[model samples]
Target chain A: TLPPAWQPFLKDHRISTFKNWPFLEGCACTPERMAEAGFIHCPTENEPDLAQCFFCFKELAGWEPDDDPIEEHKKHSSGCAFLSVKKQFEELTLGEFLKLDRERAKNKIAKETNNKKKEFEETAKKVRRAIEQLAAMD
Target chain B: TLPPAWQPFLKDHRISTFKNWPFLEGCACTPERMAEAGFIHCPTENEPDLAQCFFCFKELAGWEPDDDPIEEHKKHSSGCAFLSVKKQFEELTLGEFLKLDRERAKNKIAKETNNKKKEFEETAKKVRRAIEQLAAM
Candidate 1:
């Protein structure tokens, strides 16, 4: 692992995504700066300005050289964790890290449980519709 | 200061709000349970099923007798910190508490900064529009 903050970001080709970014004019919103602000340069065929935050999943487009990338991010996406949770993992105390890890684990468990319920609801709704439709024909 | 977990929540008339809850069904989803799951009984004049969470700011309605308050909470609102941040504040170790406090302070600072920026933008736009209108004359 490169660093806790850059963990999978640096390791899993996020930095490499900027290789085809189509612009590096030494602007405020450079690839390095964008990446530092938890953004992945997610450009489409038509739109090369699309930058998305890896943690919050909010996308920004139409970058101007003078525009502050992080400030723009804050304007649109106030609910993002990455904006406020800017503390480095390596800098956290042992107990702090463990507590954070515990919370993360709890969230993972709850999220999975929530997803399984939704999956069941999705399947069950189809079955319900099928039975209702059949009953209506009879 | 009842417990670090209950700070301001249990202290600030959340329990008294239940006096008018309308139903204390023995089955499930009691006021205590709902409060435990981070909900406050915020009923209306028309519909009383409305329950609102203090932390996430989600308002849920149509409470069923069998509906698990926490499960229903998870179904509609996943972004709530109360569901996952279940560890009591008192239970945290020394360094843990300090770190948590630091993070909270950072969030407060950032949030205030964000709001001030928005406030400036809000006022600045009106001035901009006014100048544009005067220029038209």
Candidate 2:
């Protein structure tokens, strides 16, 4: 059975978004592997081999149908919360997975709170710069 | 007839890219207006109305059916060479258009060169930061 955590993204609906991918000849980054690695297909008009993650927001391209998708995703941003635990899910257990669920939920909230606080700080920085510019226009 | 400079973008081919747009009831940012503003349609699954300009490399979204496309583009980046002169193209003539082609072509090269030079500077800055960290070790 598919784990509850990954059920939303690693499903048939997300896999179908990949168009004209090289899935026939045992490509390393097959559509199934791509979905498992948390990527959704998002091809541009010119480039058909592009994929991006919803949560981590990493967009990747210039693939040759041979590079291992999971490893590639890991090296690109190894700290992605979803992808980090996905490897453990493949090997895995029930109690540990549930514990991971709680741990991840805590960290995710902390990270989002910090990011929003930083956004407010940046806005205040911009306001200060605007004030300085206005004073200089004398 | 369209001017030679804008011939590639402001045409039938580009207009057709705008998918599910509010073109029927006279939305301010119709396909024609969007193309005239030098934007190419490149929507995400959720954001179905995003547009970007290849020349200036600016993408914009959060579109309203009532917001004027050309003016929105101009205010977003008043110095956008393409949109700045597109207004002039609306108003006037022949020799001026030809001259504008050469002028825009020159400024385009200048902008690209400065941006690439800034990229080099950023790379050097990164190297300096890495060196400082290494020295601390």
Candidate 3:
């Protein structure tokens, strides 16, 4: 990860590539979004961005933080056997994911050094030209 | 397809499952926080839910709705190729998927016609009991 400031802008270009763990697709909340959402474990009715228990679509609330964390989360909540499908999605949308090929090409060349700047600029130029050339065809 | 009203919710879920698309993971958009922002196709910078051109994440102000929608979308201001990913997702998600499932289950007979409803209710009771028993564990 780059500095906090740089990562946010670059990351906005991507971040929807998290995998759901088997039958527990609704429970895979990454740590980053959890921090942003205030470490509020389990989803509530209106909390659109937290992981749900794996049964019903109702909120997953009332867990005691002081108790064993994993065990508590493992236990299903009342009303649903599964967690909220929406909350699983919320975290995946914002967490830092592995950069794709194009993003990697852009960011890797975009270094902080002065001499390296030209190479990065040239790479971007070539990319832009390819895009333009492709566009002119239509 | 199972009615246009169901399109938005099913599309949202399909976008979630689109991550599992064999190789198209590179250019998917998040389930936008557009409720408070409002509108999926807003044009103004002030319009919080302005839809980014899927490929380039550009504001699609100049593109006309009449043009080849997919191709024009590919010509995003940012130059990334992200157009088809969302389209592929919408196809599977928006199709009459749930209706198909319901139709398949509707023909199965649990008992005689007069007591058919009772048989169906009995089966549901068994499933619910199983769920409760599992939950108790």
Candidate 4:
């Protein structure tokens, strides 16, 4: 379900909000997934799985039942903050949201940094071992 | 000019490389700025200011001098890791690059969090004082 405060933002942006996404390809498209991707499936009588983003105000139709909701949302609106499904229900101010966004970026960076540090350390150890073996070649 | 190592990645991706972005709307489209934005001005002989991104392999032709290199880069390829201009001209391994990227994000989060915490504390103090005055009355 859309948050009550968020409902008005969608209306002001003229996005007919959806309560659910109702397609069943690979069980990828669901009301829950769509809403988590920051959209509601406010489909018209003729349309199935019609979706609108609350943050970026992007409206996309013609959803395949098997279409992955996150990929679809990103393809249509790359800058949408609600791309993270875990973040859907949290009502955050703009500063808080940006901070969260930065945190995500930092997390990615930290993972990469840790991985690289390990690799760099491993390479250094290999070089050190090679030097030790050469020194003992006397 | 883009670092020579990055050239092959652009070619393998099928982007016609530009030597320079010629359609400079103004002084904003400097060679330095283009490089900083992670692009080289690989303009065709016919068009000089065509910018090609090294990381995302996006080619842009229309150059507005006032156009910020980073913003334009982001607009075209939001996922490009080289969007930060201050990061130009450094050679780092993939792990190192990722570490640097994470550092930027953490710095931003830390600054904003500190500011927000201060604001919230100030607001709480004001509320507490207001409640005390009401109780006195």
Which pairs clash in model 2?
none
Candidate 3 lDDT tens digits, B1-137: 23333333333532443222222223223333221111134445454334543222344334322334344444443233232233332243312333333332342232135367788899999999999999999
DockQ of each: 0.02, 0.01, 0.01, 0.01
Docking class of 2: incorrect
Give the residue spans of candidate 2 off by over 4 A.
A1-138, B1-6, B9-14, B17-27, B42-66, B80-93
Give lDDT tens digits, candidate 2, residues B17-122: 7777655466888888787677778898887788876446467889887877778888886777666554433333334444555655675687789889999999
Model 3 lDDT tens row, A1-138: 233322322323123221321112234334333222223234335643344321222234443223332344445432222222233321322122212223433433443254477788999999999999999998
Error of 2 at A44 (Å): 52
Instruction: Name the better of 1 and 4 by TM-score.
Output: 1
* Candidate with the greatest lDDT versus the true structure: 2
Error of 4 at A111 (Å): 36
Model 4, residue B103: what's the lDDT? 50
lDDT of each: 0.66, 0.68, 0.36, 0.59
Candidate 2 C-alpha error for residue A17, in Å: 57
Winner on DockQ between 1 and 2 is: 1
Docking quality (DockQ) of candidate 3 = 0.01
lDDT of 2 by residue, A1-138 (tens): 233444443347567777777554667888888877877788888877888764465679888767777898888968777775544333433334445556556655766787899999999999999999999998
Which scores higher on lDDT, 1 or 3?
Answer: 1
Please name the candidate that would achieve the greatest TM-score relative to the true structure.
2
Encode model 4's per-residue lDDT on B19-117: one tens digit a residue: 333534357756666665667556566766667665555678777767777788888878665554343223333344435446545544765687799
